[PDB]
Amino acid sequence: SWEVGCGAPVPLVTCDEQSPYRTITGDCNNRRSPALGAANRALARWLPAEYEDGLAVPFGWTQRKTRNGFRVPLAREVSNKIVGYLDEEGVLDQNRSLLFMQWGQIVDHDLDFAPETELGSSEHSKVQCEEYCVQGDECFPIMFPKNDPKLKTQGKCMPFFRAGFVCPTPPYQSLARDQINAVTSFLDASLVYGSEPSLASRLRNLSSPLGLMAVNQEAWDHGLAYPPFNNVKPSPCEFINTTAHVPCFQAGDSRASEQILLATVHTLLLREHNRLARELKRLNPHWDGEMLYQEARKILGAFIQIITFRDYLPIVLGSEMQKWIPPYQGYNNSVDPRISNVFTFAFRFGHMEVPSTVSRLDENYQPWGPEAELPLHTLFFNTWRIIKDGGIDPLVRGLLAKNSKLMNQNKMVTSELRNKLFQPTHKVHGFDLAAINLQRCRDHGMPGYNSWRGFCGLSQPKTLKGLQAVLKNKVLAKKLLDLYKTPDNIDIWIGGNAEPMVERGRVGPLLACLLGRQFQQIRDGDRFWWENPGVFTEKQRDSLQKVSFSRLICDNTHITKVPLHAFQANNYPHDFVDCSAVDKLDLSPWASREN
């Protein structure tokens, strides 16, 4: 033990018996072990952590040390040589709408957040890290390799602060550092409601006994709601356009405004909660504020689970869907529902599905205005383009008619993210998400590519020849071994994303395993899974089955034409139908009378 204060939240709870509703923090879901899956606990470790000193020091930290006898390559060099490309022509996913990417980021934020330590760090530390690229304490800077273009405009590095972690306590026993998951591991709409109780309360409209969530009082979108503003100064969302000075949104998850289409989906989900609460208050005039809130919350939660498991995962996992996630057989309280540390890297496959632009489309799905198509980089922490420039309807139409990027082994991450990322505590559109992901793997003590291959029962290549065969690409394998020297040292994020995709899915074998396992567990280990007998009545369940993303849009925007299968690539007008053609959520089963 030395004595640097760590990241530190506030854990466990005492358990209501027949509460038919989730706690906010996720506690008491598992009765035998009530903190399992709760927020602000350690990410689970499926494998032992791998640090330079076995405890906390990341691989890459110390210069004359090695990982299995080789130096680990600079995160930014990997990014440049393997992950980058110039030509966007032909990169789109011909069979996935942009909503596919976007629903992923949504589900990811419901499940995991490992907070970082920059905001809470001293000004000195921040300056040493950004200004001077000085490694030490929480600063683990991402150094530019020789010849990096950014040497000519941004100095020697990008600053990077280590993830928060669970505090060494008595007994004091030497144990490897564990990063925190600040949200609930359950797929439970925590990104709307919050994972912490004072936040959840602040988000609620407690001024009326109508169980509503609070909405913005300064702006509306053709009469429809926006989230409240987060009214701190300073705000990154204000920083990117001080003349507009439109703050970030306040939602159940703090990342909600990181980009405009994420904020768009958060907005839809919030609108849907209030829609539900109003429809239930009509059906059950006697229900009080709490009951309306909880019951709406419970339905929104189920909506997320259904869209995720029925529509989304089958198109991520393809032929592996059934293998990892066989038909449900009910709650198993021996299942660990916690999100693993590795899954928080595995689920960043999403970063390769994000295209270089976002479009606003009018009601004929044609470009909306003279600035119809926007570069992605201008949309990070951007709420003013929503509030001052058309609201969400034109963005929602783009979600449906435009495509996700397709992961490609020589076009991995768009430069909008690999060179122009804006980070909320800094001032430049010049960060590299890919480098940051790699650096972060090391921060979190990730075992390497082959450790995970073996965990998943997959071959572990050792030579160029073996790696070529796994990746079905000789050049990519060559470039990886020139950088990493042994496949054992390949960082999980890039190794997993390098593998060719499984049939009918959008990830390879390794990722299919890590993701498939996790999703199996968050379903099987959740007492309030929507299909678990007793959570919903059977009539409630038969209604829920009809939910769709298209109907969510129909109900919470003024978009009047939608496809049936919103995750598929769909072209207007041939694939689009009027909203009367889309099933509704029939709420009569929630009719609670006295007799």
109 given a catalytic annotation:
yes
**488 among the known binding-site residues?**
no
- Beta bridge mates, 357: 375
CA dist., res. 346 & res. 517, Å (int): 11
For 570, the token pair is 């769909």
Q: Which does 110 bind (CB under 5 to 8 A by kind): Ca ion, ligand HEM, ligand NAG, none?
A: Ca ion
CA dist., res. 379 & res. 398, Å (int): 14
Q: Which of 436, 477, 507, 562 binds ligand HEM (CB under 6 A)?
A: 436
CA dist., res. 55 & res. 357, Å (int): 42
361-370 contacts: CB < 8 A, separation 24 or more? Answer: 361/394, 361/397, 361/398, 361/401, 361/402, 362/394, 362/397, 363/397, 363/560, 363/561, 364/572, 365/397, 365/401, 365/561, 365/572, 365/573, 365/576, 368/394, 368/397
Q: Which of 121, 184, 439, 543 binds Ca ion (CB under 5 A)?
A: 184
Q: Which of 24, 36, 101, 582 binds ligand HEM (CB under 6 A)?
A: 101
Q: How far is the CB of 258 from ligand HEM (least distance, A)?
A: 5
CA dist., res. 558 & res. 222, Å (int): 9
- CB neighbourhood size of 457 (10 A): 8
Q: Which does 188 bind (CB under 5 to 8 A by kind): Ca ion, ligand NAG, ligand HEM, none?
A: Ca ion
Task: Tell me the helices (H) and strands (E) count for the chain, helix number first.
Answer: 22, 12
Q: How far is CA 523 from the centre of its chain?
A: 17
- Which residue intervals of 115-165 are DSSP H helices? 123-130
Is residue 258 a contact residue for ligand HEM (CB under 6 A)? yes
Amino acid at 439: Q
Is residue 320 a contact residue for Ca ion (CB under 5 A)? no
Q: Which is nearer to ligand HEM, 380 or 590 (CB)?
A: 380
Q: Which does 215 bind (CB under 5 to 8 A by kind): ligand NAG, ligand HEM, Ca ion, none?
A: ligand NAG
CA dist., res. 306 & res. 311, Å (int): 8
Q: How far is the CB of 266 from ligand HEM (least distance, A)?
A: 13
**112 among the known binding-site residues?**
no
Site string for ligand HEM, 309-348 (x = CB under 6 A): -----------------------------------x--xx
Residue with nearest beta carbon to ligand NAG: 208
Q: How far is the CB of 389 from ligand NAG (least distance, A)?
A: 8
Number of residues engaging ligand HEM in binding (CB under 6 A): 19
Q: Which of 27, 52, 110, 531 binds Ca ion (CB under 5 A)?
A: 110
Stretch that binds Ca ion, among 188-196, 208-216, 285-293, 398-406 (CB under 5 A): 188-196
CA dist., res. 471 & res. 537, Å (int): 47
| DSSP codes joined into one string, 540-577 | HHHHHTT--HHHHHHHHSS--EE-SSTTS---TTTT-E
**188 among the known binding-site residues?**
yes
Q: Which of 164, 211, 337, 350 binds ligand HEM (CB under 6 A)?
A: 350
Q: Which is nearer to ligand HEM, 7 or 104 (CB)?
A: 104
Helix 289-306 vs helix 260-283: crossing angle, to nearest 10: 130
Q: What is the CA radius of gyration of the chain?
A: 23
In Å, how far are 311, 312, 445, 535, 579 from 546, measured between CA atoms? 12, 15, 42, 18, 14
Residues 102-121 that bind ligand HEM (CB under 6 A): 104-105, 108, 112-114
Q: Which is nearer to ligand HEM, 433 or 544 (CB)?
A: 433
**357 among the known binding-site residues?**
no
Applying CB under 6 A, the residues found at the interface with ligand NAG are 95, 205, 207-208, 210, 212, 214-215, 217, 241, 243-244, 315, 332, 334-335, 384, 388, 568
The torsion angle over the Cα atoms of residues 160, 108, 389 and 550, rounded to 10 degrees, is 170
Is residue 497 a contact residue for ligand HEM (CB under 6 A)? no
For 419, the token pair is 């060179």
Query: Binding site residues, as ranges?
Result: 108, 110, 184, 186, 188, 190, 258, 351
Residues making contact with ligand HEM (CB under 6 A):
101, 104-105, 108, 112-114, 258-259, 344, 347-348, 350-351, 353-354, 433, 436, 440
Query: Binding site residues for heme b, as ranges?
Result: 108, 258, 351
Supply the residues annotated as catalytic: 109
Residues making contact with Ca ion (CB under 5 A):
110, 184, 188, 190
